[PDB]
Amino acid sequence: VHRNPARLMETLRTLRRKGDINPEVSMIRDIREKELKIFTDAGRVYRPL
């Protein structure tokens, strides 16, 4: 668990955009459930935006 979800999520997004982390990884933050999910397994469908 993490106490500052916003800062961690922003840092992860910045790193992914910069290219340090593979863009294929999917990071989802849910405030209502206060849950952070990171997915790297293959077979996941993604599109560019």
Q: CB of residue 8 vs another protein: minimum separation in angstroms?
A: 12
Stated as kind and residue range, the H or E segment containing 13 is: helix 5-18
In the complex, minimum distance from the CB of residue 33 to another protein, in angstroms, rounded to a whole number: 6
Binding site for another protein (CB under 8 A): 6, 14, 16-19, 23-24, 26-34, 37, 39, 44-49
We find the least distance from the C-beta atom of residue 9 to another protein, in angstroms, to be 10
Which of 37, 17, 42 lies closest to 27 in space, CA to CA? 37
The distance in angstroms from the start CA to the end CA of the chain is 29
